Structure 1
Amino acid sequence: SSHHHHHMPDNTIQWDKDADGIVTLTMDDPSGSTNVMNEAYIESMGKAVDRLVAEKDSITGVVVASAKKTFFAGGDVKTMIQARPEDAGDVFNTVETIKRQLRTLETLGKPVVAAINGAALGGGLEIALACHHRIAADVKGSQLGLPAVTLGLLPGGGGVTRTVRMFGIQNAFVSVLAQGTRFKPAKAKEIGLVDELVATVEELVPAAKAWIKEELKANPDGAGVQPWDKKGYKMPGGTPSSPGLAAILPSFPSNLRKQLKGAPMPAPRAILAAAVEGAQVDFDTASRIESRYFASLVTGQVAKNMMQAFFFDLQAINAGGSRPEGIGKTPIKRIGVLGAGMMGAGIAYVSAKAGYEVVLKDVSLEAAAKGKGYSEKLEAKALERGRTTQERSDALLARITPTADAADFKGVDFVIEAVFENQELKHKVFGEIEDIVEPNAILGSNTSTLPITGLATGVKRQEDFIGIAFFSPVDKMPLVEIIKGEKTSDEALARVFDYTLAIGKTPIVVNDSRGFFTSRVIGTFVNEALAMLGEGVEPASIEQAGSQAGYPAPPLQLSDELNLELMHKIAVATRKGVEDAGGTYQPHPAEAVVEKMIELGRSGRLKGAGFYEYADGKRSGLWPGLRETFKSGSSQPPLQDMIDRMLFAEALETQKCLDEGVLTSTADANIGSIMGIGFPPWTGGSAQFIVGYSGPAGTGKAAFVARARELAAAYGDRFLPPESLLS
């Protein structure tokens, strides 16, 4: 139990004690460009902390700075993902040592100030939280927060113990901890996470040493003593024993299940537990409870799932994984968007938000103005929130040129298409514009189901034709499904791949096939629900099984947004792809349920009536007559079987897309399923859900095969596992 991990890595901290006795610890990791909490940092901080305890006589203050672009970000994800349940001892001792170093730096009896130049994420803020004073530079792009919950972990370096002490249980949980909210340096000072702000980063350290000289002279007793280390400390909002908090304290876990909708996500409940159980005891005991909960998550499967998808899979896609293996760079000078609907308007926004000159075009100059107005009601609601200025927002709306004339595309080197799914329509619309724009222009098409191979036959330069499937709403949905046609050039992939990164979105590469990958897998999801409804399952259970599985929207509710008559046409197109090939089409039992609602005149919310009942443009409960139509309640299977049916049907269909070449890697399958079809993040993706499965039959791919065979022996042959993972 020391300051070091062992009782030969590099050194990551500099030392500088001026003639006034103010030590300046400048973190500067040589092996990388980001100060990350690794094994080399723990040894460097131990040598620097032990030196502070030995030289405390000739020291009057400490300033913690950094020499990178950012302050300090995250931790060693390579190691936390490998920690097995038997490694919980080393995981517990490691975070205990990291907090023992901070607790010594915190209780040093001298002012310790943090100079936050850039990002302070995860373990970065937890070092600043251990400081008595915090100064942040108001540089755009600097973030401050504890986003450990996104990776399935909790801030186990004093983040929970100190944020609860600074703001209270209620404030710190909902605003800082439970969602991993990232804050600007201006918003951070607003809530108390930052105490002072400076214009540039050069003002940081001289102001930190000026604050220490002021704190020592004006407050000699309380210098270097945190508010919770004083005698009369009173936690904001009270401890769990005070009457004010104890009256509303039972509502905290219930409000958490209300937000998470009963999803099996163990991280947000562990954060709430360590937050309350830490307020009942002292800091040093609270610091140890925070560690025991942290080691419980690291050795768990859900954390390894999220760390695999939200870190390794995301950094691999942004690295250029599924990019063409070797291609150069070609810029974009003018973007042309066809159609001013809900899709074409948002595309013109996210393109113009990245500073791209957009020439929006619909059939009419009237609707083209209403297409730009979609982005106007996005900048106005952003101007009300104070995130952008009037100068920048007027430059964004100045790049979009709505029009109805086809010759205005003269000079466009990147075309976007966003009209209905009609092959003869897309053939003529592209035919009116192919000879107008630059010859090098990319001919992109935002398509849902229509194959890109057939759509490319309507243009002369088929190598420049490609599919760019966005997602509604375009301003927030970050996935872009890039469909690769048979004629599509390899350069066309890179030009669109680089464009997606330029607009801050995550791309995936998909080979042309039926339903692509998102629309193909999300269909099996809504089909499994409609299958249950036809089997006599209660509709209220299907909506709970959908939300408890981890989906953002229940399936029947999604089956109303996705027009019920639109899905009937998808089954018609699939019934044509097989019976025009000779084979006998085997229809899914959900297709008969769709036509049963079509015959009743309830084909989704668009008609004003589907599975729910709608009034004044608002969803108002389920249809009362839905139970008599399908004899609901006649079959009552376990809820865990319903959850596994909607999850396996998507995991099995994802595995088929990997074999059929629809997807190249599993990183595009995991990230593509989450950021697109809405797959539960606790699974880490639809492909990760197979190898990371955990149930009452085992763990891993082997247990997935047994459970899939168990579901197939009771709910149809469609649940049998493919050969790519069988035995």
Structure 2
Amino acid sequence: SSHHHHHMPDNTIQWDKDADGIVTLTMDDPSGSTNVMNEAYIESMGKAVDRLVAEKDSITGVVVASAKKTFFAGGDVKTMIQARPEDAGDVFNTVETIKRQLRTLETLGKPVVAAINGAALGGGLEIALACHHRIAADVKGSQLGLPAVTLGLLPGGGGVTRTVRMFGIQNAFVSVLAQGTRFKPAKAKEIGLVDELVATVEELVPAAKAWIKEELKANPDGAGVQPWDKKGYKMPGGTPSSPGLAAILPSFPSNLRKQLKGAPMPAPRAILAAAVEGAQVDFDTASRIESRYFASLVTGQVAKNMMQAFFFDLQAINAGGSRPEGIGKTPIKRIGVLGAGMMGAGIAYVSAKAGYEVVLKDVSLEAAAKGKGYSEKLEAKALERGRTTQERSDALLARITPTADAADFKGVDFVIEAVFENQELKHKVFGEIEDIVEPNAILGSNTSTLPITGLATGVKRQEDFIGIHFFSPVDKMPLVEIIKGEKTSDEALARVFDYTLAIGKTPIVVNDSRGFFTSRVIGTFVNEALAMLGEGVEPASIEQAGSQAGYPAPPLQLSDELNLELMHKIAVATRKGVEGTYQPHPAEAVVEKMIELGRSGRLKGAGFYEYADGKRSGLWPGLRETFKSGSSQPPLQDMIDRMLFAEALETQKCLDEGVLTSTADANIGSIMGIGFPPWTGGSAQFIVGYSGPAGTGKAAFVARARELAAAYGDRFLPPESLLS
């Protein structure tokens, strides 16, 4: 066969043979700043590997190096996303050609060393895994891993096959492949993914050639031979035929199904199948089996959903897609958080973690001090797990300053209010610190339901009043919803945008509307669950539907966290505007019934679940008699689709009304803000990527919506903008 695709592109690899016979392949794709497994790379490595064979008599070792800041990162996502099912032959032959190059480099009869200088992610690590020795530079920003599963793919460049040969079926899957974990160079050496470390990138190539010179002298027979290519190789943990591994092997798909909660995420299933099926055969047959599973994923729809959301959409956002143009950067010196609840304390923690000086104000010093205790308990958790040092943990907490005096907001240039959800309270809270803070201080508000324009009238610098919406637990929720009031300037938008990236979170810019985007859409998700409960559907079936749809937490459990007293306030608020005659959601009757019974949520101690001591403990047994559960028994897929469509349809309304300005904001905002299932690619992508018994695409989405609308109500009727 061939090391090439066909039977035009630029050259990516630089050839250098030294007087000792060592060839240094230096990858340097001139079309970008990062080496990517594109069509140019495949051709350039094909020519390079052909030459390694032709000049084998004058070659004693190979060193794979890079000229960019990173080593090698990712594949050609612009092409993999266009692979139709009919293209399966081309996808197979491409990855087979990529792996035939690496296999030739790996069975060359001479040592090959990877000089890893930067991030070796995805295909880049697959290159280094094909070498006999891996040297990494312990520098900041360097990562190593195989994150194909996060895009709905699997490592098709030998990553599955080689990690299984190196660590066994169980260790490779759980620690490397299943979640696409990224490792720092120190951790990469510890688990056996890298062999040795060096201090600076300048020592890599010298250290690489030194190892080759030594390996040739100390190990003349085993030089350039991988452990799995030696006779008498024993896979760690055994093969599937080994009695030790066979006893626990049946529980791998059941454990995986427990972690995924029954969600239709096909990629982890495929990685486990490829991993095990490959361990039962030789290395070359295993690599071919892995190719077929890779082609199965790429030509499918979930991979297109996740490639769209977690590569293109996420990149467009981090690149400032929703950031106003022409506005420059502004530093932040002192953050002032009003209110020391779970939100304010979480806001104080994530800001102190990024390095900002935080002033945490409440109405009493006792209250503000408890708010800092949230950061202390979190740091004691990370100190016990060894994820931080005692010095950085002390410097973090020292940046948080609890207080109860409004005068301690002196020098604050970034206010983040997180007090009770009430307009005139927010008006008074801002009115007593707006004159103490800097004249250019951002006046942010963390309201969930109240319009930002209304809250802005309580300050005199309305151009700097803006909505900064966080999600609890702030330390673990990655989204910040930045609401633009009709007085908010573009500078205030960009300043909160840059603040969001600085604290390690992803922003979305949303125009001012009641409910915003996240609160409005997650409402429809929860309201669908309560409606089904009123209809008589079993509560356990509702929870199974939420988890099997792919949500991180089932919907009834989520209502207890949100507390029904908040939900009932939203219904009265959105109705007082309609006054007309209000058209209530069916869920409004269930909320009032539970509030009447004194079961409002986890905050009260009783909701749809029972709460003994501190933790949640099973559904409330009296729930079945109250709502006559078991009387309505719709198909599980109807329950799943009702929850997904309600949010997907509501998201499209936000796009039409102008609440959102891009589908990237919709997709990432729904995934990271309200927990929309990742396999959908976001609540906007769900429409174009819907697949069911009626077909696939937007037309299939409209038909399923109309079918749902006929059976469950006119709220599922698709908007005009989705039609032909």
Residues 1:250 and 1:548: Cα distance change in structure 2 (over 3 Å): same
Q: C-alpha distance in 2, partners of 1:237/1:424?
A: 65
Deviation of 1:206 after TM superposition, in Å, equals: 1.2
Deviation of 1:377 after TM superposition, in Å, equals: 2.3
- Equivalence for 1:570: 570
Q: C-alpha distance in 1, partners of 2:594/2:394?
A: 47
Deviation of 1:623 after TM superposition, in Å, equals: 1.4
1:649 to 646, 649, 655: 646
Deviation of 1:553 after TM superposition, in Å, equals: 0.5
Give a deviation string over 1:238-291, Cα, whole Å, max 9, x none. 111110111110000000110000000100000000000000000000000000
Q: C-alpha distance in 2, partners of 1:613/1:393?
A: 36
Give a deviation string over 1:624-648, Cα, whole Å, max 9, x none. 1211111111111111111110000
Q: C-alpha distance in 1, partners of 2:723/2:4?
A: 47
Per the alignment, in what secondary structure is the counterpart of residue 541 of structure 1?
A: helix
Q: C-alpha distance in 1, partners of 2:555/2:713?
A: 20
Q: C-alpha distance in 2, partners of 1:428/1:63?
A: 67
Q: C-alpha distance in 2, partners of 1:169/1:691?
A: 36
Deviation of 1:430 after TM superposition, in Å, equals: 0.2
Residues 440-449 or 374-383, more deviating = 374-383
Deviation of 1:177 after TM superposition, in Å, equals: 0.2
1:623 partnered with 2:612 = no
Deviation of 1:6 after TM superposition, in Å, equals: 1.5
Deviation of 1:12 after TM superposition, in Å, equals: 1.0
Give a deviation string over 1:360-411, Cα, whole Å, max 9, x none. 2111222222222222222332233333333333322232222111111111
Structure 2 residue runs without a partner (length 5+): none
Deviation of 1:79 after TM superposition, in Å, equals: 0.3
Per the alignment, in what secondary structure is the counterpart of residue 433 of structure 1?
A: coil
Deviation of 1:603 after TM superposition, in Å, equals: 1.2
- Equivalence for 2:596: 599
Give a deviation string over 1:411-455, Cα, whole Å, max 9, x none. 111111111101111000100000111111110001110111110
Per the alignment, in what secondary structure is the counterpart of residue 134 of structure 1?
A: strand
Q: C-alpha distance in 2, partners of 1:416/1:240?
A: 56
Percent of residue pairs bearing the same amino acid type: 100
Per the alignment, in what secondary structure is the counterpart of residue 32 of structure 1?
A: coil
Per the alignment, in what secondary structure is the counterpart of residue 63 of structure 2?
A: strand
Deviation of 1:702 after TM superposition, in Å, equals: 0.7
Per the alignment, in what secondary structure is the counterpart of residue 560 of structure 1?
A: helix
Per the alignment, in what secondary structure is the counterpart of residue 618 of structure 2?
A: strand
Give a deviation string over 1:565-618, Cα, whole Å, max 9, x none. 221111111121210xxx110111111011111111111122221111121211
Match runs of 1:692-703 below 5 Å: 692-703=689-700
Deviation of 1:202 after TM superposition, in Å, equals: 1.5
1:143 partnered with 2:143 = yes
Give a deviation string over 1:198-221, Cα, whole Å, max 9, x none. 111122111111111111111111
TM-score norm. by structure 2 comes to 0.99
Residues 323-332 or 258-267, more deviating = 323-332
Deviation of 1:495 after TM superposition, in Å, equals: 0.9
Residues 265-274 or 557-566, more deviating = 557-566
Give a deviation string over 1:8-66, Cα, whole Å, max 9, x none. 11111111111111111111111111111111100110111111111111111111111
Per the alignment, in what secondary structure is the counterpart of residue 56 of structure 2?
A: coil
- Give the number of aligned pairs: 724
Residues 5-14 or 257-266, more deviating = 5-14
- Equivalence for 2:514: 514
Residues 195-204 or 243-252, more deviating = 195-204
Residues 390-399 or 717-726, more deviating = 390-399
Q: C-alpha distance in 2, partners of 1:717/1:551?
A: 24
Residues 441-450 or 364-373, more deviating = 364-373
Give a deviation string over 1:477-507, Cα, whole Å, max 9, x none. 1100001111111211111111111112110
Q: C-alpha distance in 2, partners of 1:317/1:619?
A: 37
Per the alignment, in what secondary structure is the counterpart of residue 256 of structure 2?
A: helix
Q: C-alpha distance in 2, partners of 1:622/1:381?
A: 29
- Equivalence for 2:663: 666
Q: C-alpha distance in 2, partners of 1:116/1:363?
A: 53
Deviation of 1:476 after TM superposition, in Å, equals: 1.7
Residues 181-190 or 604-613, more deviating = 604-613
Q: C-alpha distance in 1, partners of 2:393/2:533?
A: 48
Deviation of 1:717 after TM superposition, in Å, equals: 0.9
Deviation of 1:543 after TM superposition, in Å, equals: 0.5
Q: C-alpha distance in 1, partners of 2:573/2:229?
A: 69
Give a deviation string over 1:657-679, Cα, whole Å, max 9, x none. 00111111100000000001100
Q: C-alpha distance in 2, partners of 1:7/1:604?
A: 66
Residues 222-231 or 469-478, more deviating = 469-478
Per the alignment, in what secondary structure is the counterpart of residue 291 of structure 2?
A: helix
Residues 81-90 or 336-345, more deviating = 336-345
- Equivalence for 1:524: 524
Q: C-alpha distance in 2, partners of 1:437/1:371?
A: 21
Per the alignment, in what secondary structure is the counterpart of residue 115 of structure 1?
A: strand
Q: C-alpha distance in 2, partners of 1:23/1:389?
A: 42
Alignment root-mean-square deviation, CA: 1.0
Q: C-alpha distance in 2, partners of 1:409/1:600?
A: 43
- Equivalence for 2:459: 459
Q: C-alpha distance in 2, partners of 1:663/1:358?
A: 31
Per the alignment, in what secondary structure is the counterpart of residue 620 of structure 1?
A: strand
Residues 620-629 or 152-161, more deviating = 620-629
Per the alignment, in what secondary structure is the counterpart of residue 401 of structure 1?
A: strand
Structure 1 residue runs without a partner (length 5+): none
Q: C-alpha distance in 2, partners of 1:360/1:593?
A: 38
Q: C-alpha distance in 2, partners of 1:141/1:395?
A: 22
Per the alignment, in what secondary structure is the counterpart of residue 577 of structure 2?
A: helix
Residues 319-328 or 180-189, more deviating = 319-328
Q: C-alpha distance in 1, partners of 2:723/2:35?
A: 43
- Equivalence for 2:380: 380
Deviation of 1:330 after TM superposition, in Å, equals: 2.0
Deviation of 1:726 after TM superposition, in Å, equals: 2.3
